[PDB]
Amino acid sequence: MGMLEARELLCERDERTLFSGLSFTLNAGEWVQITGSNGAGKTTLLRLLTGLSRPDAGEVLWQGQPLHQVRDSYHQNLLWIGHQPGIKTRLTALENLHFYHRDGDTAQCLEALAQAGLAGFEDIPVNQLSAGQQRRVALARLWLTRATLWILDEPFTAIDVNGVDRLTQRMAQHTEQGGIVILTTHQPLNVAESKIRRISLTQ
Amino acid sequence: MGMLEARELLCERDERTLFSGLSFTLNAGEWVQITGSNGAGKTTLLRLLTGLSRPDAGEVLWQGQPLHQVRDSYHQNLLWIGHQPGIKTRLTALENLHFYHRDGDTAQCLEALAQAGLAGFEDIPVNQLSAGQQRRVALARLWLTRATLWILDEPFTAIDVNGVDRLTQRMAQHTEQGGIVILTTHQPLNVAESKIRRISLTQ
Amino acid sequence: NIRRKNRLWIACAVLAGLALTIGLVLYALRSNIDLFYTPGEILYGKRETQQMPEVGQRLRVGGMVMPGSVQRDPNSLKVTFTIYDAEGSVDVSYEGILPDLFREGQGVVVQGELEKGNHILAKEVLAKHDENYTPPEVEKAMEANHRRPASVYKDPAS
Amino acid sequence: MFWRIFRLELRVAFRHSAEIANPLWFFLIVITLFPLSIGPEPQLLARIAPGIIWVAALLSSLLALERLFRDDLQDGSLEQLMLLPLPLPAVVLAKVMAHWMVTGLPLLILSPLVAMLLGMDVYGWQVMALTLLLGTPTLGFLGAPGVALTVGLKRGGVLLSILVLPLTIPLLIFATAAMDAASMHLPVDGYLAILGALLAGTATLSPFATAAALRISIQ
Amino acid sequence: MFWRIFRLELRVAFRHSAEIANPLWFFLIVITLFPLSIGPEPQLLARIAPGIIWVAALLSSLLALERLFRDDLQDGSLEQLMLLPLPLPAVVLAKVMAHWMVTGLPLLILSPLVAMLLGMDVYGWQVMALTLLLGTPTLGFLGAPGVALTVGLKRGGVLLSILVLPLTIPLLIFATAAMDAASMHLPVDGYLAILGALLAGTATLSPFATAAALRISIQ
Amino acid sequence: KTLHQLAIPPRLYQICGWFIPWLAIASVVVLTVGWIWGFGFAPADYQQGNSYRIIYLHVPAAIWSMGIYASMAVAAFIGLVWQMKMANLAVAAMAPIGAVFTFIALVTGSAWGKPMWGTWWVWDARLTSELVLLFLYVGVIALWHAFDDRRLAGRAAGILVLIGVVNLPIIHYSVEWWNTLHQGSTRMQQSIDPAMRSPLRWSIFGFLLLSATLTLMRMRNLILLMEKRRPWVSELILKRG
Amino acid sequence: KTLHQLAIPPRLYQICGWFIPWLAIASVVVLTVGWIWGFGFAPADYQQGNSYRIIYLHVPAAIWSMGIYASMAVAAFIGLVWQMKMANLAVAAMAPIGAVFTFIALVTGSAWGKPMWGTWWVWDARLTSELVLLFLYVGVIALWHAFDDRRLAGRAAGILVLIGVVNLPIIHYSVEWWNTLHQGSTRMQQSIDPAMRSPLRWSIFGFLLLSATLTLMRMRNLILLMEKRRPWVSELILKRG
Amino acid sequence: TPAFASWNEFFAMGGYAFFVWLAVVMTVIPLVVLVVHSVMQHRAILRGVAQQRAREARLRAAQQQEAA
Amino acid sequence: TPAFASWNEFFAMGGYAFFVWLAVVMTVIPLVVLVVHSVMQHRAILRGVAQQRAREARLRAAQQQEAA
Chain G contact present for I47, CB below 8 A: no
Q: How far apart are CA E69 and CA E88, in angstroms?
A: 14
- CA-to-CA separations, D125 to D114, D120, D180, D182, in angstroms, rounded: 9, 6, 13, 9
Asked if C21 and E197 come within 8 Å (Cβ–Cβ), the reply is yes
Q: What is the dihedral of CA F96, F97, F102, F108, to 10 degrees?
A: 120
Q: How far apart are CA F127 and CA F105, in angstroms?
A: 8
Give the N- to C-terminal CA distance of chain A in Å, as an integer. Answer: 29
Angle at the Cα of F137 from the Cα atoms of F173 and F130, rounded to 5 degrees: 40
Q: How far apart are CA D148 and CA D66, in angstroms?
A: 10
Pairing of strands A32-34, A197-199: parallel
Hey, is G152 helix, strand or coil? Answer: helix
Q: What share of chain B is helix, strand, coil (3-state, %, to 5)?
A: 30, 25, 50
Helix ranges, chain E (H): 2-15, 22-38, 42-64, 66-75, 77-82, 88-118, 122-149, 158-183, 189-218
Collect all residues of chain E within an 8 Å Cβ-Cβ radius of residue D33: 51, 55, 58, 165, 169, 172
User: Phi/psi at E215 (nearest 5 deg)?
Assistant: -65, -35
- CA-to-CA separations, I63 to I57, I66, I67, in angstroms, rounded: 10, 5, 6
- CA-to-CA separations, D216 to A40, B47, D151, G75, G155, in angstroms, rounded: 33, 13, 11, 17, 8
User: Phi/psi at B79 (nearest 5 deg)?
Assistant: -130, 115
Report residue D42 CA to chain centroid gap: 28
Burial F54-66, CB ≥16 within 10 A → b, else e: bbbbbbbbbbbbb
Sign of CA dihedral E174, E180, E182, E185: negative
Top residue of H55, H63, H65 to mutate, by most chain B CBs within 10 Å, is H55
User: Phi/psi at A38 (nearest 5 deg)?
Assistant: -75, 150
Hey, is D206 helix, strand or coil? Answer: helix
Q: What residues does A151 pair with on adjacent strands?
A: A80, A182
Helix H or strand E segment including C81: strand C78-84
Asked if B40 and A128 come within 8 Å (Cβ–Cβ), the reply is no
One-letter identity of residue G145: H
Collect all residues of chain I within an 8 Å Cβ-Cβ radius of residue G51: 13-14, 16, 19-20
Q: How far apart are CA B10 and CA B55, in angstroms?
A: 7
Q: Which of G6, G3, G13, G8 is nearest to G221 (CA)?
A: G13
Nearest to E84 among A75, A82, A89 (CB): A75
Q: Which residues contact C74 (CB under 8 A, 6 or more apart)?
A: none
Q: How far apart are CA D66 and CA D52, in angstroms?
A: 22
Q: What residues does A16 pair with on adjacent strands?
A: A13
Q: Which of E34, E31, E98 is nearest to E60 (CA)?
A: E31
- CA-to-CA separations, B123 to A158, B99, G12, in angstroms, rounded: 39, 14, 61
One-letter identity of residue B186: H
F175–chain E nearest CA distance, Å: 8
Q: Which of A152, A132, A134, A133 is nearest to A142 (CA)?
A: A152
- Beta carbons of A52 and E82 less than 8 angstroms apart: yes
Q: How far apart are CA C99 and CA C80, in angstroms?
A: 14
Q: How far apart are CA H20 and CA F44, in angstroms?
A: 13
The long-range contacts involving C11-14, CB below 8 angstroms and separated by at least 24 positions, are C13/E204, C14/E204
Collect all residues of chain H within an 8 Å Cβ-Cβ radius of residue B120: 55, 58-59, 62
Hey, is E9 helix, strand or coil? Answer: helix
Report residue A47 CA to chain centroid gap: 10
Q: How far apart are CA D93 and CA D203, in angstroms?
A: 8
Q: How far apart are CA D161 and CA G139, in angstroms?
A: 9
- Does C27 carry a binding-site annotation? no
Asked if F228 and A15 come within 8 Å (Cβ–Cβ), the reply is yes
Collect all residues of chain A within an 8 Å Cβ-Cβ radius of residue C3: 69-70, 72-73
One-letter identity of residue G22: W
- Beta carbons of I19 and G112 less than 8 angstroms apart: yes
Pairing of strands B149-153, B78-81: parallel
Helix H or strand E segment including C84: strand C78-84
Q: Which residues contact A139 (CB under 8 A, 6 or more apart)?
A: A81, A85, A116, A155, A159, A167
Q: Which residues contact B140 (CB under 8 A, 6 or more apart)?
A: B97, B112, B113, B114, B115, B116, B118
Burial C50-77, CB ≥16 within 10 A → b, else e: eeebeeeeebbbbbbbbeebbeeeeeee
Q: Which residues contact I2 (CB under 8 A, 6 or more apart)?
A: G40, G41, I10
Give the N- to C-terminal CA distance of chain I in Å, as an integer. Answer: 81
Q: How far apart are CA G160 and CA G137, in angstroms?
A: 10
Question: Which DSSP letter does residue B32 get?
Answer: E
Q: How far apart are CA B56 and CA B53, in angstroms?
A: 9
Q: What is the DSSP string of C10-63?
A: HHHHHHHHHHHHHHHHHHHHHTT---EE-HHHHHS--TTT-PPPPTT-EEEEEE
Residues in chain H: 68
Hey, is F111 helix, strand or coil? Answer: helix
Helix H or strand E segment including B12: strand B4-12
Sheet holding B32-34, edge to edge: B78-81, B149-153, B180-184, B32-34, B197-199
Q: How far apart are CA A176 and CA B164, in angstroms?
A: 44
Tell me the residue range of the domain where A118 lies.
Answer: 1-203
Chains H and F touch (3+ CB pairs under 8 A): yes
One-letter identity of residue I63: Q
Q: What 3 state SS string does chain A have?
A: CCCEEEEEEEEEECCEEEEEEEEEEECCCCCEEECCCCCCCHHHHHHHHHCCCCCCEEEEEECCEECCCCHHHHCCCEEEECCCCCCCCCCEHHHHHHHCCCCCCCCCCCCHHHHCCCCCCCCCEHHHCCHHHHHHHHHHHHHHCCCCEEEEECCCCCCCHHHHHHHHHHHHHHHHCCCEEEEECCCCCCCCCCCCEEECCCC
One-letter identity of residue C77: L
Q: Which residue of A has its CA nearest to E16?
A: A90
H9: alpha, beta or left, given left = phi > 0 and alpha = psi -120 to 50? alpha
Hey, is G184 helix, strand or coil? Answer: coil
Q: How far apart are CA C87 and CA C144, in angstroms?
A: 9
Residues in chain D: 219
Question: Which DSSP letter does residue C91 get?
Answer: E
Q: Which residues contact F156 (CB under 8 A, 6 or more apart)?
A: E149, E213, E216, E217, F143, F144, F147
Q: Which of A198, A200, A149, A157 is nearest to A175 (CA)?
A: A149
One-letter identity of residue G87: A
Neighbours of G226 (CB within 10 A): 17
Asked if H16 and F107 come within 8 Å (Cβ–Cβ), the reply is no
Q: Which residue of A has its CA nearest to F227?
A: A15
- Beta carbons of G144 and G225 less than 8 angstroms apart: no
- Beta carbons of F64 and F208 less than 8 angstroms apart: yes
Q: Which of A181, A198, A192, A146 is nearest to A28 (CA)?
A: A181
One-letter identity of residue E30: V
**Angle, nearest 10°, between helix axes H18-67 and F54-80?**
40
Chains that touch B (3 or more CB pairs under 8 A): A, D, G, H
Helix H or strand E segment including B17: strand B17-22
The long-range contacts involving E118-126, CB below 8 angstroms and separated by at least 24 positions, are E118/E31, E118/E45, E118/E46, E118/E49, E118/E52, E118/E53, E118/G121, E119/E42, E119/E45, E119/E46, E119/E49, E119/G119, E119/G121, E120/E46, E120/E49, E120/E183, E123/E182, E123/E185, E124/E49, E124/E179, E124/E182, E124/E183
Chain E contact present for A88, CB below 8 A: yes
Q: Where are the domains of chain I?
A: 25-68
Q: Which residue of D has its CA nearest to G154?
A: D216
Pairing of strands A57-62, A4-13: antiparallel
B38: alpha, beta or left, given left = phi > 0 and alpha = psi -120 to 50? beta
Q: What residues does B87 pair with on adjacent strands?
A: none
Tell me the residue range of the domain where D165 lies.
Answer: 2-218
- CA-to-CA separations, B91 to A156, B69, B139, F228, G23, in angstroms, rounded: 37, 34, 17, 20, 63
Chain B contact present for G82, CB below 8 A: no
Q: What residues does A47 pair with on adjacent strands?
A: none
Q: How far apart are CA B63 and CA B49, in angstroms?
A: 13
- CA-to-CA separations, A195 to A33, B125, E176, in angstroms, rounded: 11, 46, 70
I35–chain A nearest CA distance, Å: 27
CATH number for the domain formed by residue range(s) C36-153: 2.40.50.140
Q: What is the dihedral of CA B56, B58, B60, B64, to 10 degrees?
A: 150
Q: What is the dihedral of CA E125, E126, E128, E133, to 10 degrees?
A: 130
Residues in chain A: 203
Q: Which of B97, B91, B88, B73 is nearest to B147 (CA)?
A: B73
Chain A contact present for E77, CB below 8 A: yes
Q: What is the DSSP string of I4-27?
A: -SSHHHHTS-TT-HHHHHHHHHHH
Neighbours of I5 (CB within 10 A): 8
- CA-to-CA separations, D137 to A29, B87, I31, in angstroms, rounded: 66, 27, 42
- Beta carbons of E173 and D36 less than 8 angstroms apart: yes
Chains that touch C (3 or more CB pairs under 8 A): A, E
Q: How far apart are CA D94 and CA D110, in angstroms?
A: 24
* The total number of structural domains that make up chain B: 1
Q: What residues does A125 pair with on adjacent strands?
A: A92
User: Phi/psi at C47 (nearest 5 deg)?
Assistant: -70, -35
Q: How far apart are CA D78 and CA A106, in angstroms?
A: 50
- Beta carbons of F120 and F108 less than 8 angstroms apart: no
